[PDB]
């Protein structure tokens, strides 16, 4: 079904390659388009601007139980900028960094009396 009039682009993370400096490996990313979802801010706070100022936002996403959504894992990203095709965006670009969120917590599915998934709720965060 449809739960809203917004389109988001879930991004998967899968590290690959020979270890680099400090034992870290490069990150390979894959993007998938999921339309017809609802995305709304949940909470937001700020740290006192004594010497360094940090601000955080929390958002909620409700999506149909599609194959791509159910396969998301903690540590992934999703990209949203209020456009119809956000997937065709450069993550390396400054706009991409400004429009990429971080998945917070595990996937939360909702079940019915028939034992079938009805919708999925996901927590997101972004800081500056």
């Amino acid at each position: 079904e449809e739960f809203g009039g917004q389109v988001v682009a879930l991004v998967s993370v899968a590290e690959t390659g020979v270890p680099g400096w400090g034992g870290l490996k490069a990150k390979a990313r894959t993007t998938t388009r999921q339309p017809g979802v609802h995305f709304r801010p949940a909470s937001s706070t700020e740290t006192p601007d004594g010497q360094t100022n940090v601000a955080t936002e929390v958002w909620k996403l409700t999506a149909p139980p599609t194959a791509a959504v159910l396969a998301a894992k903690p540590g992934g990203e999703l990209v949203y900028d209020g456009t119809e095709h956000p997937e065709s965006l450069d993550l390396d670009s400054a706009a991409g960094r400004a429009a990429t969120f971080r998945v917070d917590g595990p996937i939360m599915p909702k079940y019915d009396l028939a034992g079938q998934v009805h919708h999925v709720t996901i927590m997101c965060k972004r800081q500056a």
Binding site: W21, L24, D49, Q51, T52, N53, V54, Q127, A128
Partner: protein, 136 residues
Amino acid sequence: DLHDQDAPDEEDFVVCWMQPVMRTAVERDIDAELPFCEVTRIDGADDPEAGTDDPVIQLDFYALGAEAAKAAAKQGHRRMLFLFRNFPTVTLSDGTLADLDFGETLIKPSRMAFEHDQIVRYTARYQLGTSYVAVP
């Protein structure tokens, strides 16, 4: 009426010295470029009779990712070592010329916790030796 001698401002000294190699300020705004050093003073002691001053200075390095943060910390430590060794002259914001007496490294750059989950913070600590110049 105030006294006629005082040591040069340590924070201004360090900022004007590190600025040519990397962005540095006493305070970081909410948004800026990653390469960044922050200066602070934690302790010191002044002796008017002997003209002796022993300030302690802290440098914090912020950068995106562990690799960039470590590279910035290495560059900052090398710049500080150059300053300690060659004793160059530094021009402050006020235009005055100031120098050092010696220098010593207390804590080599290490990793510290930070609220932001992408920016990695490295911290180093240094000790300086300064004298009294005439107030203009």
